Structures are given as structure tokens and as C-alpha cells.
């Protein structure tokens, strides 16, 4: 099936816990895969304008590890619950992709999660200004705009609203699209 095929692809890139004990400032992100209308989509957040780190930006759910978290996956799931109401029975964590090194002292670990068909996002306004889906295939032929560095623009056909996606967020989206959609019969 579509979903079994995605998970089987994703598992070949799982690095597991290999880089998780290293002495960094530690953050985790959740890459949430949603199946609608026979196709896969990624779920994104728009960060609240009130926050210290990165106000108004498009990012995946995630944040800083804390002492309650049993491991890096737990951080990602805690933070997704707090931001959009995603509960643990509603997500299957399939793998851990290559981590992102930043600022010489920080390591960000991404997890890919398959989201239950009855989940419906409840944006928490203290953290998140908006929540939106993008079809995974978009990231193979994106609408690119140079600021010199590359920015993606996605317009939702439901309502005509445009979103800008950039940096590590855009990089991870492309990676997941390649892993899952490369070399497929039609
Ligand atoms: C989840 C941890 O996020 C960070 C941690 C450190 C620096 C930048 C970011 N982001 C993440 C993606 N959106 C921009 C800001």
C-alpha cells in the first residue's frame, strides 16, 4: 500500500540513536505525514509572533529537550502535543533522519511520524498562529524565489493564502520527498 511503501522507504535512512548521547544543546522536530485524497502531505506550523525564537516563521512542530523526556523522540511528541493537540495514540514514529548541526554548540534531531486519519489540528494560539498542509510532491517541483538564497512559495488552492518556507525546514521537506517519491511507477 501507499503507507507501507512510505515506511519501508523511510526505514532505510534511519540512523537510530547513533548521535543522541553527544554533549550538545539538544532540540527535536516532528515531520508529520498525513494521507488525504490518495496522496501524502506534510503538516507545518506558523510560529506565534510573541515567541523569542523565530516569531512568525514556518517550521515543523518541535523544540528543546527537557529533563522529563525519556529520549529525543519524546521531546518531538511532547512539543507536537503542546502546539497542535497531537496525542500519542495518533502518531507512529517511523524513523530518525540525519541531525542538523547549528551554531557550533547545537544539534537538532528530526523524526518522521505517520499521523492517524481522524486527527484534526487544534492550534494553541500562545505557540502557533496557523497550521497548514502541503502535498509532499510539491517539494519535487517547488516555486522558488531568491532573497542570494532559495525560498519556496506555496499557495493553498482552498483559499489563495501564500506561505514562505525556507532554511532547515525547506531542506528537510525536500529530503523526505526524495526518500518517499523517487523512482516510483505511475
Ligand atoms: C526546534 C528548534 O528550532 C531551532 C533551534 C535553534 C535554532 C533555530 C531553530 N529553528 C527551527 C526551524 N525554524 C526556524 C528556527
Swiss-Prot record:
Modification N6-succinyllysine occurs at: 7
Domain spans labelled Nudix hydrolase: 24-149
Annotated site residues (Important for coenzyme A binding) in this chain: 53
Keywords: Hydrolase, Magnesium, Manganese, Metal-binding, Peroxisome, RNA-binding
BP GO terms, sorted: acetyl-CoA catabolic process; brown fat cell differentiation; butyryl-CoA catabolic process; coenzyme A catabolic process; malonyl-CoA catabolic process; medium-chain fatty-acyl-CoA catabolic process; nucleoside diphosphate metabolic process; propionyl-CoA catabolic process
Catalysed reactions listed for this entry: hexanoyl-CoA + H2O = hexanoyl-4'-phosphopantetheine + adenosine 3',5'-bisphosphate + 2 H(+); octanoyl-CoA + H2O = S-octanoyl-4'-phosphopantetheine + adenosine 3',5'-bisphosphate + 2 H(+); butanoyl-CoA + H2O = S-butanoyl-4'-phosphopantetheine + adenosine 3',5'-bisphosphate + 2 H(+); decanoyl-CoA + H2O = decanoyl-4'-phosphopantetheine + adenosine 3',5'-bisphosphate + 2 H(+)
Cellular compartments annotated: Peroxisome
Binding site for Mg(2+): 79, 83
Oligomer and partners: Monomer.
Family stated for the protein in its record: Belongs to the Nudix hydrolase family. PCD1 subfamily.
Physiological role: Fatty acyl-coenzyme A (CoA) diphosphatase that hydrolyzes fatty acyl-CoA to yield acyl-4'-phosphopantetheine and adenosine 3',5'-bisphosphate. Cleaves CoA, CoA esters and oxidized CoA with similar efficiencies. Preferentially hydrolyzes medium-chain acyl-CoAs and bile acid-CoAs. Has no activity toward NDP-sugars, CDP-alcohols, (deoxy)nucleoside 5'-triphosphates, nucleoside 5'-di or monophosphates, diadenosine polyphosphates, NAD, NADH, NADP, NADPH or thymidine-5'-monophospho-p-nitrophenyl ester.
Protein name: Peroxisomal coenzyme A diphosphatase NUDT7
Residues included from the entire protein: 14 to 209 of 238
Amino acid at each position: 500500500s501507499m503507507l507501507d511503501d512510505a515506511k519501508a522507504r523511510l526505514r532505510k535512512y534511519d540512523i537510530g540513536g547513533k548521535y543522541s548521547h553527544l554533549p550538545y544543546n539538544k532540540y527535536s522536530v516532528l515531520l508529520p505525514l498525513v494521507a488525504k485524497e490518495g496522496k501524502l502531505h506534510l503538516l507545518f506550523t506558523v510560529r506565534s509572533e510573541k515567541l523569542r525564537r523565530a516569531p512568525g516563521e514556518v517550521c515543523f512542530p518541535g523544540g528543546k529537550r527537557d529533563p522529563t523526556d525519556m529520549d529525543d523522540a519524546a521531546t518531538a511528541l511532547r512539543e507536537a502535543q503542546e502546539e497542535v493537540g497531537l496525542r500519542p495514540h495518533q502518531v507512529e514514529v517511523v524513523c530518525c533522519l540525519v541531525p542538523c548541526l547549528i551554531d557550533t554548540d547545537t544539534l537538532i534531531t528530526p523524526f518522521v511520524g505517520l499521523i492517524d486519519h481522524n486527527f484534526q489540528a487544534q492550534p494553541n494560539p500562545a505557540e502557533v498562529k496557523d497550521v497548514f498542509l502541503v502535498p509532499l510532491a510539491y517539494f519535487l517541483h517547488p516555486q522558488v524565489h531568491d532573497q542570494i538564497n532559495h525560498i519556496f512559495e506555496y499557495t493553498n488552492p482552498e483559499d489563495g493564502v501564500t506561505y514562505q518556507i525556507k532554511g532547515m525546514t525547506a531542506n528537510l521537506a525536500v529530503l523526505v520527498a526524495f526518500i518517499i517519491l523517487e523512482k516510483k511507477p505511475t
